[PDB]
Structures are given as structure tokens and as C-alpha cells.
Design a protein around this nucleic acid. Sequence first.
RNA 1: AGUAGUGUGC
Length: 2031
Amino acid sequence: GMDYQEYQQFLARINTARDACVAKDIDVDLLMARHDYFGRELCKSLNIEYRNDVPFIDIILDIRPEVDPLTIDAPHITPDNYLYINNVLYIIDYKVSVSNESSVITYDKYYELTRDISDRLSIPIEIVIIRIDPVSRDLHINSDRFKELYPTIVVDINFNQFFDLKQLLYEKFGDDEEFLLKVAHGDFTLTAPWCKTGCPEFWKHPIYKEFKMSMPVPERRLFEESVKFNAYESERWNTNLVKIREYTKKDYSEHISKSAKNIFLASGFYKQPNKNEISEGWTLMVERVQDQREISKSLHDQKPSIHFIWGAHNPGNSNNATFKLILLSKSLQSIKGISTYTEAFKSLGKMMDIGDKAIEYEEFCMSLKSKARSSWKQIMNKKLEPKQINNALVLWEQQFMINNDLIDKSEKLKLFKNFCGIGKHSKPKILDFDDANMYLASLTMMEQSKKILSKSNGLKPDNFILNEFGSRIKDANKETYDNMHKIFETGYWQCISDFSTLMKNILSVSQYNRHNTFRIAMCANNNVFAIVFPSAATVVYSIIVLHKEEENIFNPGCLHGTFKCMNGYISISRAIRLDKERCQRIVSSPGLFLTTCLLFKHDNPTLVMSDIMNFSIYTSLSITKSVLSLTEPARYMIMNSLAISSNVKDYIAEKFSPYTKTLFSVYMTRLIKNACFDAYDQRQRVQLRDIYLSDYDITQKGIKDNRELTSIWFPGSVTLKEYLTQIYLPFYFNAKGLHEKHHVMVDLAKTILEIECEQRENIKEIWSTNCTKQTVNLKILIHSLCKNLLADTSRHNHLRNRIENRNNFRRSITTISTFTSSKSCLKIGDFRKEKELQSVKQKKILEVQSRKMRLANPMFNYEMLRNAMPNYTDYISTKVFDRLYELLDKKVLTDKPVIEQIMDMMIDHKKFYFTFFNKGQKTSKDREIFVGEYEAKMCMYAVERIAKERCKLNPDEMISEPGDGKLKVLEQKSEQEIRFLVETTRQKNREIDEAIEALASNLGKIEKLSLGKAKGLKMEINADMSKWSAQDVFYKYFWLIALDPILYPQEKERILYFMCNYMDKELILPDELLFNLLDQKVAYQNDIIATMTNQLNSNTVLIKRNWLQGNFNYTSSYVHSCAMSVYKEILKEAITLLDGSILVNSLVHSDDNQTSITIVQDKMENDKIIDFAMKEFERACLTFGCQANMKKTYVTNCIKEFVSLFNLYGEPFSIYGRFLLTSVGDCAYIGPYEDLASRISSAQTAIKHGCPPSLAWVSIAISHWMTSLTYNMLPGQSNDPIDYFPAENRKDIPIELNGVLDAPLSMISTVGLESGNLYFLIKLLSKYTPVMQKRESVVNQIAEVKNWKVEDLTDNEIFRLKILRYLVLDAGRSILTPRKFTTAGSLRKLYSFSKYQDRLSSPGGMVELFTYLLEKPELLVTKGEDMKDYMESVIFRYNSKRFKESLSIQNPAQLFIEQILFSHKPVIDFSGIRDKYINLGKVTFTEAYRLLMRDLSSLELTNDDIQVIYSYIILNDPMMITIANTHILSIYGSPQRRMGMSCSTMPEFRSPALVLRAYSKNNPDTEMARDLVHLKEFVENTNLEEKMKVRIAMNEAEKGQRDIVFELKEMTRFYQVCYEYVKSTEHKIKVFILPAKSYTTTDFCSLMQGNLIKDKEWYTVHYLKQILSGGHKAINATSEQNIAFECFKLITHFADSFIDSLSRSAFLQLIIDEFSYKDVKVSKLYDIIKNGYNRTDFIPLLFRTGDLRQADLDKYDAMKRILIRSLDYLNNDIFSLSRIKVGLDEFATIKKAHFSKMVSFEGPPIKTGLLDLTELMKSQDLLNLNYDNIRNSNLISFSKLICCEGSDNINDGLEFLSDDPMNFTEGEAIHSTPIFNIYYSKRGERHMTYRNAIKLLIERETKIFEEAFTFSENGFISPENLGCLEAVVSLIKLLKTNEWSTVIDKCIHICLIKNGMDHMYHSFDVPKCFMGNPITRDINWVMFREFINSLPGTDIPPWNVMTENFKKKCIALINSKFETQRDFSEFTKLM
RNA sequence: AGUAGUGUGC
Ligand SMILES: [Zn+2]
């Protein structure tokens, strides 16, 4: 990026400097260094000459020197650069800054002065100031004339390297306040106050009394003093803040020492995990569980592991519906024996008989299905009636009627009372997992499963996934394709998939399942069936299977019993009562399952594939809560047990509680138990990779991947990365929303009331010194607040200004999202009236639904609560957008500034109320959400937001960093430590290491000195705080508001009052919880809920110290940061004692914490400091009121846990798996494209977090599978659109119609779904383009499109383009989307929806809205900027029936079934499809394909229509421009192993609602005026201004009068398509893990491309031309130049690196003339360099050719006193093209380029004795700049570099190679606790030249070739063998020159030239033996043939296989020559 | 029967 020379000198100046005024100048010099750097590279980007601080009076003299500068008055300014074209002078003053505030100042200053001579000379002078952003990198130019000149400018600039120097300078001097004084943009500017008057009540409040009670009396007054302090009044802002700092400095200075001095007190005794410590924990766990749960040893109490019973399919019987129905009927009737429900199952088969009348079932059912398939809506009013067939009364296809005559009254009861459990109505029941005869039973269940499921399907291993994605999986990694087959083949896959396909059909049936009906559900298996019994939503089902022989059935613990029938055996499973939410997951279980297996097995050959799948079905299908209780606690139980410092005992003895209800759970528990002990013995089995560090980051970082560790869930060995996956991944198998709300509300309530009681009874004291639970070290707090509050205001002065802007404090409440959102909200008051009326309605609807059930199968309160509970404070649920509307209409909210309204609300609202609703997430331990009043939301907003922008300043806080941005931060901080550790070790041990190499004589004396030295120590505290919210003093936060400098006194009074009320805040127990406790039935022994509510009197309990979970994150997080800031100071004083160095780095995120400590020792042992660090860690937490959970907290020597994002020893790594398990049931079930959109987004996310392409593609397959399974769009399904459309396969069917996503992953990762459309257009620009222009930019290939011929194209090719233009372009672009008939639902709670009723009811008032909205069309798309505007927007919104539904929650489970059932019904309205073709009702999916073709065939494809596609898609979006370029200019290079992974940021490829108001009326309300100009162009170029008006203007003559509906609906479309153009998208933080650091776009592109090709090897990427094009106005000049630079940089270095010094000019001269780099002649590139204005870059090149003149030297010398003859003399002994002396010791620079580019050279061969330097250029292996790599290289690699034309003495011929020394890589151990070797590049000695390397290679490798090709006991001598050699090398020329043969020839050649036998080799033709007659050149193939067989061969590596293949090839080939398949008639003609 | 459960439900 930047120059290396200036970096080194600026780094040294930071250490050299001591005083702040010296450090000041280093910051000033760094600005100019960046200033010129931007200018140097931009001048080449614009092709102009570079200049610096050139006077304006001289700039005119270049244009017109006839008038002298004295008489003509020119403005005396100092511009940077100038240009004169088109009779206009353009003045340049480039500058790099974040804001244009510094640019407009210099703009108007220049514009004013330049006008003095602008009218004097009558030549207009334009000011062109170019500014670039130093982080986001965006170009900003003010000149409009300059915009039209340069359409696109190349800006791949690097500031990343500049900020590295800034970090160093603001580290040493950043602590000193003398340096902070010098950096200022106003010193300190405090903005306008948010309030006018203070708060008197705050000083009176009893909580403020209680605050000062505990506090000491000097502190009491200080708090008074601090609040009343105004920062704007006193001379400086830090008057008070420093004053209170200096008071507490007595106790602080002492307490910092106190903690630090404990380093000597410590011992080598810390909570370390050990086999016994784990064992002890388990035993106390057993005791706990055996009390807390009812332990059972009986095998009848178990629950099903899986809720399914699979049995082998029967191919002998027919696979057809009607047949199976009767088959199961007779089968069920035929059941023989006696049980409980035997005669019940018997009659059920009897009630589904058809027999003779099989054909009547085929018709009757098809009529009913056809009746429903006609209508969009369901068939209402008409009564469904059954038809008597044999004994059964069929109601629908596979639906029957329960006939009360066919079953006994007693036998009907048995089935429903006992078996189905309809009418059945104290510890939990669990299985003893410590019983070996229970663990046995559990193991035998697995042994049983493996015995049956391992057996193959025997059916074709070809399903949609493999059929359509197999190709794209296989090419990524062939292993995974096979792995997939291995699964699909095995009964495992058929078992799950048939349960999936069966459940889909169980749900589909269960929807219309009545109370007098039992339904039958069949699957792809013709033995497996299911019976769905009447449900009293709840699905009641049994799996009924007809397995072959007895016990050829899989029972996981689900089966009721097997039964013998009259033909075979039939088994019926226990009645399962599951919920649709659970069942859904079972349907998507195969996708979950495949991923599980593939992820585990991936690239690990030691694992048993049949054992992975054996475990996987029991996970992917496990829907019980038994499993979650294992999967979650395991993650910590393993990691704790393999960490260094960690408390396992306590975690296993308290936090671990198995709920082993099922039988898999028992087996899985013991898998975990065992895995805990294996960890302890593997702690030291972890190794640390050899770190190849050579300045600016490291490649080959992180942990060593060694397969020495042991797996957890199955047998085999595993890698660390894989071990971690096996540890953490299990938890993501867990299922969401399993927690029954009835139980959650109780346990959530109980906990809050338990911890509040704790505080009420036990915790009384607030502050303390000894450090105790819920206590803060008040003196230490106040100081550490003061110190940080200073540094978080000194580093940014406008801090109060930044808060106002970024959080919209000044603007009206109606603008901020958090307030105008559709989130849940709590309303307080009295609703006893409507709450009673809303309840009794449902209590009647209860009886309504019961009355109807009494007729068919006779099986069978809010008033009470209010009457019973006296002190019941009444509340209600509402919406956040609705509350705002309510508070405005009743006028308490206004257009007053939101903060100004907040301040008043803090003092107005005095009592705060909060309610909780459960999340019920995948975790077994349930999480609560506290949601209270809207009034509260406003208060917390300010307090939290003020802390937000404060927290952002501190780099330690990470809640500030949105998205997965933390991952890179982990890395950047880990790398800083790995570097520091090395740097510091080399700085101390250098004195000792010198003596070691000196003596190494006797080695017995060396060990004495090698012991007594410095010792490295790294450690990471992977923390997790205990009860961050509940067990935390809220009183401490009062001080943060008090001490605050950027808060006014009248604000400070008001903030603290609200917080004073947030102590007397009440928790409302929601009614649903109170209803559970309403019906007593004997109360709880010790009822905590009743205790706190006084035997249930009030529904409110007061919560004090427990500030509610998530309400004060940032606030608490700043105090956390302040706490860890102390921990730093503690250790940093402790390590100065021992005399060494320490680097502590703390990452803070509310409750999740990570703190990395790196120490270089001298005195005491490493293990002492380990215990010391942990002591002060808890101390640091507890001195601030927070307590650290030592249970979950673990410490490693590498690993970093932080928010579950993991960084290893530099190498960042997340659990790629967790995101692949999302693409299964994560969608809103809207449409085929709409579903896939989010399912592929989940796959895109995996790639970010370092996922292999092979597995990435799997998710893409699964996603498609589920997507197509939802709407019956799979191959062979109903809506299968391959026959309906013209196409070969689903790759060619548009993804809008649902097909497959045919694109490269490197595109899908970037854009996705749209990629599939983009690839179909790039395919064309690689088919329908000529030989010229195709190799050039994409832009050029788009110009040729309008010169194509339409007739050339094919049916499919035409088909895409027609939809792509007439449909896709304008309409998340979908065409097919099913519409529903859903109802609005109950919207009574809403106030705002009532005001729509009143405006709809009263006549005229409706139209009045729409007529008002037409004069303000800004309020159709965006919400109002003012009260009325926002309010009336809310009412209009209700117009949409979709927005009315949006505020109601539909179950995705129910939504899923509704898209299956409504697929054969008319759902897609064609009206909205045909409208576009023209500019009936709903249409069925099948008909939608037909009716699309009837319209499509009519449309016309032109040479223009196609050119609109290539404009609107490619040429419009600068991103799509580059993506297409990257895939056309792509040149994939060297395949390499993924050694070093690094984090990389996604690059850039680039007023809202107020602008649209200035479009409605052209007058705005200055910068916003300029924004409308480009908006005018957008609407005029597309011409959508007229197109919209014409569409309305001709509709009023179509309809008749004035339709207000069309007046708006068409006007809204016009404003919504504006929104996307006007309101710009925020470039959110996206981090991709790549094989190296991506600085700029091009770098990112190359590394991204190469990461998503193969799994085993990543590839480095090249490009012919620049890929970064900006549009279709910008059509090469800037793409050419850089090629010339690359070329000559490459050549000069290749020449001075490898070619002999003596003959380097000749080489260059030969290369320049007859050669070409990247299809451009090197001469033309040289001419481009010579005609350029940066010749100073290529001084040594120009001198060597004789194209260097004095002007260049004079310029070069002026950039950073010379003569030509001086150079001519000086460089008489320096022979290099990359370097010439331009002084006494100053050499010239050529700037080295990478050597992976030399392949892009194409010229005639240059032969040098024997070597062909062209082939050395074209070589891959022999281009490394490492001596050892080339010395220890293969002869196969070198054998390409030989021609020799009969040379001699190989030693002589190698004279044309560099006899200059090469660079070797040396490595050394670092002497850390995690001991690793650093490897770096040295310069070797002298005898390490390129020649000697080649020679040593030749010698070593030829010796091995000789002994392999002896074929006798002689050698490479003895003509008896030379004859054999001649024979073997003869055939090689008379056969076929493939690739294997030629190598042998050239190797033999080499070997014979070496031995001095190259005076005959060239005169070696076929011997006399083989040649019958010498003259008559006849060949005896038979002889030759038998000669090849008669060759013995050798088995020495590496030639053993080489020779073997050669022989076979040559034999086969020879035999081929003979074998000529002649025509049968041919010979019959000749003779 | 199942699902939930050292909080009494479906
Ligand atoms: Zn030769």
C-alpha cells in the first residue's frame, strides 16, 4: 500500500520522543504524509502530472506568458495541481478528511480570489477540490464540469496502514493531557440545553434520602456539588470532574497498590479441572437429581426417543393409493390375538373397507376434490355427507366415519379414554442414568437401530438434492458427494425421509379431521402408514406398519405392540399427541439430519459414517425437552474440563441437571459424562502452529490441526476445530418454543420474586471495602468513573453534539423508529368494563363449540379474578405506533423536540409499571423479556442513548460494534498480543541467547544460563457474568449521571428523578399466570408468589435493585468498562514490580466478557501469576457490584469465547454449522422466491463465518428442497414446471417461476438469487460476441448486444429474455405468489383502529382523507415529519387489508399447511401479470403456467428489448457491473492449502422523506435543492413522470367519472419507486473469513473468488483489465497503464532475481521487443511508461535502455544535484535492472510486484546453452524466492527448462542464472507457556545463490532418476544399457507426445548431458534390432511391444507409479495403432 | 397414551 521507508522512520520517532510538543509535530507530519499519498496515486488515476504547493501567478504563465506577472493582478493562493482544457482553468487542492466542512471553507476562499483575474483575462477558472473519506473511501468533488470529464476514477487507496502509526502515537502520549490539548476542533463546544427548569422533587425523594444514608458526609456534599456544576459556566469543562478525581486519589492509589502487591501473596493453587474434581461434582449431582426428581429404573416409564416406527417396504405388493387403503383395511381386520385395544383396532379396519366397490372410491373422492378445487374460498353453507361403501362411510379421500354400531360401547371407550387419553383427568419421572442395566438397555436400543438402519434401501440413491445439486457438490469436494450417497443408500435416510413425507401428510389430513372421523395418512413406503384419531392445536396420531417378518421393525420407544395378521405382521404405535409447531420441524428433519451428518463426517476419515447417522436421527427428530438439558450444559461442561483455570465441580454439582425422560437421553448423558474426562487428558494434546511472521499481519497463524483428540458422540479421532464444533454445535440441534407457557410464566415470576425477597431481607448495605455480594467500593467507583469520563470527553469534544444528531434528539418523536414501530406496549388505567365483555364472549364460544361436539361422538374467568383480588392495578396490551397516536390525539405528545418532551415526562411520570412475556428459546433455561409503559420507553431512550455514543468512544465496549464485526476485533487484539509476546521476548533474551550459540564445546554449561531468563505468558479469561441485572447495585449508576460533563444541572436533576422512580417500580404479574393460581387445588408449601402478593391480594410486586433485564445495557457496559479499566491499572502496576512488560486487552458486552492478559516475566514462576490474575479478576468485578460466574468462566492459552464468536491463536473461527441448520423452517411462507430469499440468505451467512463450499451448496440444495416441498414444485409433484415451459432442466427455468439457482457460489455469496439471473446474461456475453472485445471489459461486450441477430437464439434463450424485460424489470422480484382469504381478526385493544371505524362510518370523511393525501403524496410511502401528517398516515394505513393483518400473528406451522392445501386451488390472480403485457378471477398454479405461455408467445423480442435488460440490471448497478467483470476477467492461479485464515471487511460499490415533499411542490425548505436535480434526471430518463400521468388520464375515459381509488394507487407506486432511489441503504458491517487480509475491493474480489471453488485448495486470482467500472458513460485508458507498471515491475525483478548479473541488459532488450504481457506488446507498455508523467518510478529501467534524461532525476530529487555521467560512472559495478546508485549510498527503487503474474507473458523461446528462460517465466515451482524450497524441489518441475540443441557440461550451461545470494526462512521458539515457533525471512550468506540451488537439486534428484532407470547392474554407462535407454527414448518420439513420456525424455536428456554423453543422445534413432531394413524405414511394433514387456521396472519413489503408467500407456497406445475397426464393405471392394 | 412438570396444565 504505502512506502515502507517512511513507515519505519515515523515508528522510531514515536519511541524517540518523550515530550508532548515533539509528539504533536509527528501527528502534523503524518497528515502531510497522507495528503501527498492520496495526490500521488490520484494524479496517475487522472493521467495528469503531479505538482505540490505551486503558486497561482506561475500557473497562468504556463498558459499565457505574454503579459508579465507584475502588471496583471493574480490572486496569491497555493493550489496543489492545475489543468487547462476547453478554455477553462481547473484548480486542484486535494485533502483527506471525514467531513466536507474543511472543503467548503477552502472552496469559497478559492472561488472569491480567482474572480480577480477571471474577468481580467476573460477566461473562467473553476475550483475542483477532491476529498476522500479516510475509512469508508468515497470520492466527493464539488466541480460539476469535472464530473462530465472523468466518468470513473480508480481509487484503491489504503489508509489502514496510516492508522497503525496513529495507534502507536496515541498509546504512549495518549495518557498525558499535554498532548490531548494540541488535538482540538474547538477545544470543547457544548450545544443547546434539552431543558429550561430543574427538578425540586428529586432532592425530596426518599430514594435520594436512602442514597445519602449509606454514603459518607464528605461524599454527600460532593454529590450536591457535582449535580449543580455547569460545564459551560466555569473556564474549563473538567473543573468538577478533576476536582472530585483528586479527592478520592488517596484511597485509589492505595487500593491499586493493595491488589497489585498480592502477586507475591499468591501460590500455584487455582481451581484447575482434574479427573477426581469432575467425579466428585457428578456424585453430588446424582444426590441432587435423586431428590429433586422421581428416579425410576423401570423400562415402561420411558418416553419415545423418536415418535415413529419404521419397517421395511414390500415391493411384491402394489405401490398405489386405492390398493394400500384396502390393504391396511384387511390388515387391520386380520389382526389376531387378545390385548387391551385388540377388538378396537379390528373394527377401525372394518370401518375403512371398500373391497368390491374400489372404483366408487376413485370417483366419489375425485368429485369432492374437484368441488373444492373450483373455488378460491372454502365451500361454505353446503353440507358434506358420506357414502356407505361395504362397511365404511367414506367422507373424503382417506377420511372415514366412526360407526357406533361397528364398535362395542366398551371397546370404543377403551380406545379413547385409555389409548387416545380423551377424558383421563408429584415429582417429574426420569430414568436412572447411573444404572449400568439402564445404560445397557439404552445402548441395546442403539445397537438395535444400527442393526436395522445400516441395511441399504436397495432403491436408486437419486433424490432432488442429488439429482439437481449433486453436480455442483461433487466439483466442490468429491468426498462429500460420496458421503451424501453413503447416507441416501442407507436405511437411515429412507427412515427419516418417509417420517418427513408421512408427517407432511399427517398434518395435511389433521387440518380437516373432525370429532366423528379417523383419517389415514400414507407415505412413499407401501408398508408404513399413520392413523390420525379425532383431536379434542393438537395432532393425535399412531404409526401403523406392515413389516416383513416379526421384529423387522425399528422401535425407539414409540411402539405400543406388534401383532400377527392373516398374511404378515402389523405393528401399531402408542397414540402420540404432538402440536403442529413440533410436527413442522419433523417434516424439515431430513434437511437438519443431512447437514448434521455431512458436517460431522466432513474431511475426517477416522469417523464411522453408520455411527454418525445412528446418533443423528436421535438428535434431528428429538422433539422432547429431555435432550436440551444435555446439549446446552455440555458446551460449558467440556470447555471447562479442558481449560487451564475453571471451576467444573461447582458447575456439574449445581448448574448440570439431567431430565433423562426418554431412552436416547440416558445413552447421550453417559456420552457427555465420558467426554468430560477425555478432555482433561487431551489438554496438552493441543499444538500451536508455526507462525510465519514477516511484518504487517501473518500467514500460517492459529492452532495446529492434528487428529490426536477423541470424538464425543461417536467413535474415532478428531481435530481441535472439529472437537470445538462437536462441543458447541450440539446446542443448535435444540428446538425453539418447546417450553409450555403455562409453566414458564410461573418459573420466571418465581425467580424475580425470589431475588427481590433476597434483597428485601438480606442485602441492606450498598457500599463496602472487603468486597461482598451486591456491594460497590464507593470511593474506588467515583475515582474510576471520573478518570474514564475525562478520557471519553478529551478524545471527542462535540460529544453532546454527536448524541443530538445520531439519535435524533432534536427532531419530533414521530421521526424515530423505536417510538413509531409496531411493537408490544403496556397501557395502565381501568379497562374492567371492556376486559369483562371481551372475556364472556369467548366463555359462550366455549359452549358453542361444546354443543356441536355432544351431537357427533358424546365423549366430552376475569370476573372471578377482579372479585377475589382487591389491590388489582388494571392494565392492557397495545401497540407502540398506536400509543403514540393515542397520546397525540389526547394531546400530551406534540411536535416539540423528543428530548424536550422526554425531560418533562421524566418529572411528569412518577410510578413505573412493567410486565414480562417469555421468549421460550432453544435453551433449556428459559429467558424473560420485560416490556412496560411508552412513557418509560421515552425516559430510558435518553439515558441509554447518551451512554451509547459514550460507550462507542471506548474501544473496549463491543455492543457499539453492530453485526459480526466483533470477530475481526477479537483477531486484531489477539494478533497485537502474539506480536508483542514475540517483540518483548527478543528484547530481553537477546543478551542471554548470544552466549548460547557462542559455546554450542560443552552443552552442560548452556542449560544453567538458559533456565535463568524471561518467560512469556498469554491467557484469555473467557468470562460470563452471573445475574448482570438482578444481583447488581443500581445506586452506582446515579454517580455516572452526576459526574457527567456534557449534561446540564437542570437535566441532571430530572434524569436522576426518573431513576429515583425506577427504584419504586412495580411488576404486573400477567393475567395468564394469575389464572393458573386462581384455581387453587391445595396451595404450594412455601408459596413465594403468594408471600410477595399477601396470599394473592395485589397483581403487582415492587422491584428495587433489580433494574429490569436489557433496559440499561450500555449504561452497565460503561461501568463494566470502568471496572476492567481498574483491572488493567491493577496488573500494569503489578508487572512493574517483577520488572518486565504486560499487555491487557478487555472486550466488554453487558454480561459476556473476554479479557486477554500477555505478560513477559523475569522473577517468579508462570503458575503463580495465573492464580494472581483470577484473584484480582473477581476483586475488580465485585468492587463495582458485578459478580463473575466462576462456574461458566474458563481460561485458555489460545481459545477466545466472546458472544459465541470464536478466535483461536489469531485464526478466527465461528461454528459455520449453526447457520446451515436455519435453512429448514425459517420463512413466512409467502411465495416460492419469497421463501428461498431468506433460506439462501442463511447459506450466504455461513460463508461469512468460514464454511466450506461443498457444505454451503448442501444448504442451497435443502433450501430449494423445502421451498419446492411447500408449494408442490418438486420433480414429479403437481405444480412441476419443466413440461409446462420450454427448457432442458430447472437450471434454465427462471428462479421467479421456481427452478434452481444456476450461478457460481462466489456470486451467490455476494448478491444471491438475482445472481441466477445475472449468470444467464454473462453466458450470452461469452457466446454471442466476436474474438475482439470479448477479452476486454464487460461494458464493451454490452455495446455489441445491439449488433446481434434475434433469429440466432433458441426456444429457451428467447423464453428468459421475454420475462426478464416485460415482467422482471419492474413490479424481492416475484411473479407467482398465492393470495389468501384471511380475516382482519380482533383489533379492539387499539385506539388508532377505532378512529378508522369512525372515519369509515361517517359519510364524506373517508374521501376527505384521500383528497388531502393527493395534495401531500409524501405521506403515502413515509410517515409524517409533523403531528397531523404522522397521525392521518396511521389511519390511511388501515386502507390496506395486509397492514390490518400485519398487526396479528399467524403460526408458521398453520401457514405451512395452508400453502400445501391451497396449491391445487385458484390462488394466483393473473390480473396483475397480464396488466404488464396489456400495458377472470384467481388462477390455479397449473393454469398459471398455461395462461403465461398464451400471453408470452404473443410478445415480441427485438435487438432493443435485450439492450434494456443489459442497461437496467448490469449498467445501472455499479456492483452488478463489477461482479460480471470479476467472472469474465477471472484468471485462477496457484492452488494452495488454507494455512492462515484472516478476517476481512466487505468493500463499497457506491435527505429521505423531506425530498419527496420538495418534489410534490418544486420549492423545498440549499443542499436538499441540489438533491432534487439528480432526482429530476432519474424520472425524465426513465420517463415515468408522463407514463404514470397517461395511465391515469386514459383510465378516467375508460371507467367514466372520477375514481379516487386509481387516482391514489397509481400515484403511490410512483412515490414508492422514488423511495428506493431517494432514501439510500446503510452499508452495514459484513465480515468474511478469507485466506488473507482484504484491504481494498480488488484484493477482496480475488480472495473471495478463490475461497469458494475447492474445499482442499484455495486459489489466488488475476484479472486482464480493471474490474472496477462505474457505468456506461465511462467506456480502458486507466485499465491499460497499470498493466505497463505490473509488467516492467515483474520483468525488472525477474531479471535481477534469477537471470545472471553479467547478461541482464541483453535479456531485457530481447524481452521488450518480441514479447507481450496480458495480450499487450511490452514495447507499447514501455512507450506508455516513457510517455507517462511518473518515469521517476522506473529510473533504473530507463537508464539501462538509455531513455533517462536530467528532467526525470531533477523531478525524482524534488519528490524526496545529479548528472547522467555520474550515474554512468557510479553504476559500472552494480548489475541489476531493479536498482541503480543515484548518489554515494542512495539506490533507485523499481517497487517489487508479486511473482504469480509471470504466467501472463507470451513470447518466442530464448535458449541459453540448455535453459529456456521463457519456460522459467512460465514455470510455477522454480519461481519461489526461498533457497531451501528450490534446493529441495523435484526433477519433474525442472525437466520443463531444457532444450540444449546438443549442449555439453551442464555445469557450464547454468552460467545464465543469478550468482547472487537468496532469502531463506528461519524459525525460533518464543519461550511462552503456549510454546510456538516464529518463522521469518533472512538474507542467507553467499554460497546460497540461485545456481547452487539448481545444481544441488539436479545432483540430488538425478541420482534418484539414474538408479530407477538402470534396468541392469551397471548404471547409466555400458552400451548394453545405453541401447535399452535408446530403445526406451525411441518409442517416446514414435507414439503420441502426451505429458508423461516427454518428462522421461527430458529427464534422460538431463542425466545424459550431466555424464558428458550429449554427443550421441540427439543421434539416437530406432536401433537395427527393431528396424528390419535400415533404408526401408519399417518398424517391428511386435518386437517394440515385446521390448516394453521385457523391461523389468523399479518400485522406488517417486518414479514407481510414473514408469508403471508410462509403460501401460505406451503398450495400450502401440496396440491401438494396429486395432483399426475397418468397414464391413471396405475390404469387399478392394479384392 | 403423549406433551409439559421438585407449581398443581393440555
Ligand atoms: Zn542435450
